[PDB]
Design a protein around this ligand. Structure first.
Ligand SMILES: [Mg+2]
Ligand SMILES: [Zn+2]
Ligand SMILES: [Zn+2]
Ligand SMILES: [Zn+2]
Lengths: 98, 112, 96, 87, 171, 180, 44, 156, 491
RNA sequence: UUUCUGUCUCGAACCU
DNA sequence: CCAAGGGGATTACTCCCTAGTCTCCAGGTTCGAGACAGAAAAAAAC
């Protein structure tokens, strides 16, 4: 059921992903022309529920301090779409690769 | 004087109930308990702290501790003793293993 | 039946060393143990059917000795080698 | 090394036979006779190997010797014929 | 290499064999056990000397078994090869890899890379032979080889040899 | 494997791994091969060596002694000596043991001395040298003609015998070779 | 000898029924104890 | 940072996180301005049986985790500041046998028995009267069918 | 087992003790163990690589060990080994590790003292290993720094450069299964550093302590490669086929292997250095409870059923333990126990034996011309009546059962054979009363076969036995050899 | 003409 | 001049106090209950 976003790590239930997906990266998915189900992956890990990404040092470590409070996964298996990868040069893989 | 007084105590405690034991048994008891410099107590910490065979020593109270000390200090357990020969299941030099038995090739040939 | 410590003592007093040997080896449990001369360990891969004797780990094929010991003594030694202690058994005297 | 061995002279152990030596010798002769060794004495119908052994010891016709181990490893070498089995 | 050393062996004999002839019996068995044997540790045991004066040490009755263990002391002539000594032998058999040379009770193998340039194989003769510019190696020919390595098996010894230095080969 | 053979040198071989020295010609002998050997009666003497002829001679003395013992027990020029040796060995052993046969052929056909007096004389002359028994056995057994050839034969024996005494022993051996 | 001494000293101990005596005293003797229940001294 | 690791029951860690957040969100929905100060909570699969939580003071985690099963609030420890980049790095992890018989020339005559074994010429019978086994020659026993009646001698 | 071997037959007459090296264990092991599951995977018993690996020993009557091909009767079991991913303290020697650490430098690996101290020379004069180590350690506790030089007796001002590190030596304290060192920057001493310093100890240095270079160096006092017992040391037990329970030791071994594979994965993958610390602590704890279940101030390992797990220390520990319960005193056949009754019509040295007990107990008598007729008669009679035998041992060594052989009379007793004839009258048999308080409580008596269910013994022999016929029971041991009979009759 | 089963482990009660 | 002289301020040892091991006969005989159990994932096949 529940899945994790490959791009930035947000975790929500399958119904929530069908409803709105990633509000943090809905724009990036819309430009890249890829829906959320293909960017999300079933195997994930490191699920931190951030309430204050601006002040939290964990959010700075995981590069999510600029976004809104919620789930963010340190490890999200799979390979993000190449189109999104080129659209995000500063993005680096969250599964330890590269 | 310690050996003499100790024999005197053992004689007293034995003869209190009227039983008589031969002197040489008490003498051996005190002499083993005094063969070292001081009084080797017949205890976990006494005679079994001496330097006999490790397999003999381990059969008394501290088994595994003495075996570890034997492994660390690399003791050559003598096998001249009862408990080690019993552990090995061979004729301990008790009274019958105190010698060997041979064949007179000489006299076996001399008669015939 | 069992041959307790006290009865072992009584036989030790009697002097029947042959009795004790027979009673604690042949009548109880006798195990043949091949050992290597260099190491003196129970590590001999004895193929009596093929008569092929070797203690690998010392490379020898010629200096191998059987002993008769109780299975309890065998398996004490196995526990000691499981517990990082060496039961070593040899063909000589050194102190003399 | 033979130097530990004592020659036939200068032996300090008792010629009088010990009960343990007697018992071992009777047993050893008993195995030998029970397993078809030659018998050194005329047999008057005796059939128990222990009895045959006692008879041979009585006549001092037992071909056996004893190394009498001195506790240092040396030994005194004593023949059954010469060992005075008094008891 | 043909020396005399004092050794000793323990022989296990049965109560059943205690007549006055047990000595001649024990001896036939001694020769049975030592004549023709070989060991890595001591080498090849070729013969036993001074039979009539062998000091037979006295036996040992086993503590519970009836058997008698006699440790027999004796001196004997043994042979054992060492790397680098040069010895002579006879060709016993040929093949494409070289030829085996019989030296005493052992065979010496001369590998192809340690053989002279000018000396090579030739199967036009029956049996195949080896020819050189100044030498002729064949079955019935005596040759001098240097032992380079020894391999000791359970009941055998093997030697590897070479022929390169001066005065070696056909003699 | 089988009943091995014992030895008198009660070395300190307790637990020791493979530490055997190399076996080469440079006097780095094995653990048994000291210059000093133990005796029958606990005595210590030097290792004794012998040439091929002395080896065959002691073998023959042993064999004829065995034949005399066997007879007592049951009582109550390259063409003839070889046959005598052959029939002696056949009468001695059963025949299945070829090992003695092959060795005896190997020794008969390229030994040099044949006489007790000659082999005795050789050993008396080598006694004065006092060199190492294996090495003197080599000088008495293998044939040499020049100092350089001898030294490359036995690189160990380089600064042990000077040239003149080396040549004397060489020509003496060459003269003492028997003409068959 | 030693086992003989052991049995001969232990046999009266089992049938063993002022100063201390009996099995408590024998245990005290063999287990050389610095503390002593009823130490005594006889000065002539 | 302030990061404390708490022992918990192995294998259920995600269920613990999900329950903890649902409690937190319900607490936020019920509570107004003054919310609980829990910066975030997470777990680790391969270091199973353990949770990591950030919060300023221990009383916050106590007042959060009261009533939460399968967490050992008593068992908590400081994570060192130097240890955090390595913890948060992305790249981690015989027909006569058995027959009724009657004995005929012996002291046990007229007695039923059951043949147990036959060693040849001598049959062992357990007596159908006495708690004892007896050997007796099988020829001299009269055998009976499964029920009583006619007695047949040894001719079968 | 029984089979014609070829190595020399002899007895052991020494036991040298020591510790294995990991190289020794690797050399001696026949198989490497890496899979914690023991068997039952894919429904094949031969689980290659796991516990109970068939190369270690035959788990059943398969007739094939595949290391020796000897069958379970004869195969002595062959040791496995497991390279632990990090070195582990050995519980028995942990105090000795502490003592050596107080004795030597933790960096330069040299004894804090040397022959330049008079107290140290006097300590070193002691010949005995144990007392010498005790003196060395009592002298080395006081020093708390690896000094770079000592005053020399030649002049006070001139000092000798004895060498070594300059650092201060820690005070070491015991916390559970680990050593903490305080310099105070307190920290747990890593087993890696302790192993490295032990290996760096010099030869004279540790030989000066109670160690030897071939027997046991302090370096191998720490466990880097655990040897695993073969199946004969860890036999399975079974309700029926459906439920087979493995041994406590097998479960501890599997648990250790799970801890080690987890630690190896944690090493190979990302290494946080605190979870690896936790896994190292767990694996040390598991090895510790495996080898010793009586740690001071630490919880005992509990088995799946909640009782304490049976460790090797426990299997050697007490009276039930192996030394006192299977070696000093053990069990034996050819024996009987039953009630005793008085009997004044019996000779003093005679003892009455029930007919049944005589029928079961046997003496192996060898066939000679001197008893061939009586032995053939006994065999013909067979085991059912008293004068007779049960077994006939031929020359090849195989036993034939006379009760199951119907051609018993047809068997001819060739020579050298044996028969297990029932004990007849006038047979020496030891007679013992179980409270063997003293020497005369075990005496050899002559059998008198006597038809009844109770041992009868002469009344005057009740005093040395301390017997009373008030429900007492006594113990009859039948000798099995001519030596044994001769000893019992003459001694 | 087809045979050498098979156990542990925690206790309880009783006998000498 | 002198000859001690009381500590400075560390050495050196010495001698006394609390917390942790490891028992506590020599044996037999029957008798009984217990080999967690819960839960979820992979595989079977109605
Ligand atoms: Mg009573
Ligand atoms: Zn070995
Ligand atoms: Zn095997
Ligand atoms: Zn230092």
């Amino acid at each position: 059921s529940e899945r994790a976003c490959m791009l930035c790590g947000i975790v929500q239930t399958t119904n929530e992903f069908n409803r709105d997906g990633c509000p943090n990266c809905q724009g990036i998915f819309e430009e890249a022309g890829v829906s959320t189900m293909e960017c999300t992956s079933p195997s994930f890990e490191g699920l931190v529920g951030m309430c204050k990404p601006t002040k939290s040092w964990v959010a700075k470590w995981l590069s999510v301090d600029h976004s809104i409070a919620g789930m963010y996964a340190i490890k999200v298996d799979g390979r993000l779409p190449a189109e999104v990868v080129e659209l995000l040069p500063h993005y680096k893989p969250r599964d330890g690769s590269q | 004087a310690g050996r003499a007084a100790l024999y005197k105590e053992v004689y007293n405690v034995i003869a209190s109930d009227g039983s008589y034991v031969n002197y040489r048994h008490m003498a051996l008891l005190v002499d083993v308990m005094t063969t070292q410099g001081g009084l080797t107590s017949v205890t976990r910490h006494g005679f079994n702290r001496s330097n006999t065979g490790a397999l003999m020593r381990c059969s008394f109270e501290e088994t595994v501790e003495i075996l570890f000390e034997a492994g660390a200090s690399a003791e050559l357990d003598d096998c001249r003793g009862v408990s080690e020969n019993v552990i090995l299941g061979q004729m301990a030099p008790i009274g019958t293993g105190a010698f060997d038995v041979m064949i007179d090739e000489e006299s076996l040939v001399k008669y015939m | 039946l069992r041959f307790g410590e006290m009865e072992r003592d009584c036989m030790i007093a009697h002097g029947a060393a042959s009795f004790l040997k027979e009673r604690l080896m042949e009548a109880s449990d006798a195990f043949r143990v091949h050992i290597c001369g260099i190491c003196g360990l129970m590590t001999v891969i004895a193929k009596l059917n093929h008569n092929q004797f070797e203690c690998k780990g010392c490379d020898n094929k010629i200096d191998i000795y059987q002993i008769h010991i109780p299975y309890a003594a065998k398996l004490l030694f196995q526990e000691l080698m499981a517990m990082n202690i060496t039961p070593r058994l040899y063909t000589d005297r050194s102190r003399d | 090394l033979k130097e530990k061995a004592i020659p036939k002279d200068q032996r300090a152990t008792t010629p009088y036979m010990t009960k343990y030596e007697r018992a071992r010798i009777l047993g050893t002769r008993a195995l030998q006779i029970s397993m078809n060794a030659p018998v050194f004495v005329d047999l008057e119908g005796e059939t128990d190997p222990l009895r045959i052994a006692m008879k041979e010891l009585a006549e001092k016709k037992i071909p056996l010797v004893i190394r009498r181990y001195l506790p240092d490893g040396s030994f005194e070498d004593w023949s059954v014929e010469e060992l005075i089995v008094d008891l | 290499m043909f020396f005399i050393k004092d050794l000793s062996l323990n022989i296990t004999l049965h109560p059943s064999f205690f007549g006055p002839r047990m000595k001649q019996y024990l001896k036939t068995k001694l020769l049975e056990e030592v004549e023709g044997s070989c060991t890595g540790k001591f080498g090849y045991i070729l013969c036993v000397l001074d039979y009539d004066n062998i000091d037979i040490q006295r036996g040992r009755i086993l503590p519970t078994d009836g058997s008698a263990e006699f440790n027999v002391k004796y001196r004997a002539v043994v042979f054992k090869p060492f790397k680098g000594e040069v010895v002579d032998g006879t060709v016993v058999s040929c093949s494409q890899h070289g030829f085996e040379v019989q030296v005493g009770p052992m065979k010496v193998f001369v590998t192809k890379h340690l053989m002279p340039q000018d000396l090579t194989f030739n199967a036009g003769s029956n049996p195949p032979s080896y020819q050189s510019s100044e030498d002729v190696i064949t079955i019935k020919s005596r040759i001098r080889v240097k032992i380079e390595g020894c391999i000791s098996q359970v009941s055998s010894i093997h030697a590897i040899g070479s022929i390169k230095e001066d005065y070696l080969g056909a003699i | 494997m089988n009943v091995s053979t014992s030895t008198f040198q009660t070395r300190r071989r307790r637990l020791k791994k493979v530490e055997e020295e190399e076996n080469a010609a440079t006097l780095q002998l094995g653990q048994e091969f000291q210059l000093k050997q133990i005796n029958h009666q606990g005595e210590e003497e030097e290792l004794i060596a012998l040439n091929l002829s002395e080896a065959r001679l002691v073998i023959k003395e042993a064999l004829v002694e065995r034949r005399r013992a066997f007879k007592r027990s049951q009582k109550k020029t390259r063409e003839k000596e070889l046959e005598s040796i052959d029939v002696l060995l056949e009468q001695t052993t059963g025949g299945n043991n070829k090992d003695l046969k092959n060795t005896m052929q190997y020794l008969t056909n390229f030994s040099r001395f044949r006489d007790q007096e000659t082999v005795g004389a050789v050993i008396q002359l080598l006694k004065s040298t006092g060199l190492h028994p294996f090495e003197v056995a080599q000088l008495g057994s293998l044939a040499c003609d020049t100092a350089d050839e001898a030294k490359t034969l036995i690189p160990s024996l380089n600064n042990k015998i000077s040239d003149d005494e080396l040549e004397r022993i060489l020509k003496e051996l060459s003269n003492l070779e028997t003409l068959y | 000898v030693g086992v003989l001494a052991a049995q001969s000293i232990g046999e009266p101990a089992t049938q063993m029924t002022k100063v201390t005596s009996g099995v408590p005293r024998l245990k005290e003797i063999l287990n050389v104890a610095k503390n002593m229940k009823t130490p005594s001294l006889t000065v002539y | 940072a302030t990061i404390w690791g708490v022992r918990c029951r192995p294998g259920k860690e995600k269920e613990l996180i999900r329950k903890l957040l649902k409690k937190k969100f319900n607490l936020d929905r019920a509570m107004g301005k003054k919310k609980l100060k829990i910066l975030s909570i997470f777990q680790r699969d391969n270091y199973t049986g353990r949770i990591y939580i950030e919060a300023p003071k221990q009383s916050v985690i106590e007042k959060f985790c009261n009533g939460v099963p399968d967490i050992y609030i008593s068992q908590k420890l400081l994570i060192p500041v130097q240890e955090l980049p390595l913890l948060l790095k992305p790249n981690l992890e015989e027909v006569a046998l058995g027959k009724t018989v009657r004995i005929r020339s012996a002291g046990y005559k007229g007695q039923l028995g059951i043949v147990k074994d036959v060693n040849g010429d001598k049959a062992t019978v357990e007596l159908h009267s006495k708690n004892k086994h007896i050997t007796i020659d099988k020829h001299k026993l009269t055998y009976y069918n499964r029920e009583g009646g006619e007695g047949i001698t040894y001719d079968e | 087992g029984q089979q014609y071997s070829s190595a020399p037959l002899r007895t052991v007459k020494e036991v040298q003790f020591g510790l294995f090296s990991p190289e020794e264990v690797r050399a001696i092991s026949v198989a490497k163990i890496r899979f914690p599951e023991t068997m039952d995977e894919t429904q094949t018993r031969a689980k290659i690589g796991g516990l109970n690996d068939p190369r270690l020993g035959s788990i059943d009557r398969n007739l094939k060990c595949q290391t020796c091909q000897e069958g379970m009767n004869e195969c002595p079991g062959h040791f496995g080994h497991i390279d632990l991913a990090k070195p582990v303290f050995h519980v028995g020697f942990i105090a000795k590790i502490k003592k050596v650490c107080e004795c030597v430098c933790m960096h330069c690996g040299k004894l804090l003292l040397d022959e330049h101290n008079e107290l140290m020379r006097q300590a070193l004069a002691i010949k005995d290993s144990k007392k010498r180590f005790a003196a060395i350690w009592t002298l080395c506790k006081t020093k708390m720094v690896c000094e770079t030089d000592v005053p020399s007796e030649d002049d006070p001002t001139q000092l000798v450069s004895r060498g070594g590190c300059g650092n201060t030596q820690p005070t070491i304290r015991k916390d559970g299964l680990k050593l903490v060192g305080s310099w105070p920057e307190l920290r747990v001493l890593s087993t890696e550093e302790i192993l490295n310093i032990f290996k760096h100890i010099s030869v004279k240095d540790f030989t000066s302590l109670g160690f030897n270079e071939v027997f046991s160096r302090p370096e191998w006092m720490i466990l880097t490669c655990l040897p695993v017992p073969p199946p004969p040391v860890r036999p399975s037990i079974s309700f029926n086929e459906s439920q087979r329970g493995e041994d406590d030791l097998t479960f501890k071994l599997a648990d250790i292997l799970k801890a080690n594979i987890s630690l190896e994965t944690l090493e190979h993958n990302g290494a946080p250095h605190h979870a690896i610390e936790e896994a190292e602590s767990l694996l040390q704890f598991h090895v510790a409870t495996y080898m010793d279940n009586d740690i001071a101030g630490q919880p005992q390992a509990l088995q799946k059923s909640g009782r304490p797990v049976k460790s090797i220390r426990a299997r050697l520990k007490g009276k039930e333990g192996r030394i006192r319960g299977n070696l000093m005193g053990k069990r034996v056949d050819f024996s009987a126990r039953t009630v005793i009754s008085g009997d004044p019509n019996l000779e003093l040295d005679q003892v009455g034996v029930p007919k049944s007990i005589a029928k079961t107990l046997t003496y192996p008598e060898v066939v000679t011309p001197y008893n061939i007729d009586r032995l053939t008669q006994l065999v013909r009679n067979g085991p059912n009546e008293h004068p007779g035998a049960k077994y006939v041992i031929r020359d090849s060594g195989d036993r034939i059962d006379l009760r199951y052989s119907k051609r018993a009379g047809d068997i001819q007793l060739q020579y050298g054979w044996k028969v297990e004839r029932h004990i007849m009258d006038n047979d020496p048999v030891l007679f013992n009363r179980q409270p063997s308080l003293h020497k005369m409580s075990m005496m050899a008596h002559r059998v008198k076969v006597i038809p009844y269910s109770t041992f009868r013994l002469n009344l005057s022999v009740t005093s040395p036995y301390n017997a009373d016929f008030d429900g007492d029971e006594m113990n009859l041991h039948v000798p099995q050899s001519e030596e044994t009979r001769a000893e019992l009759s003459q001694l």
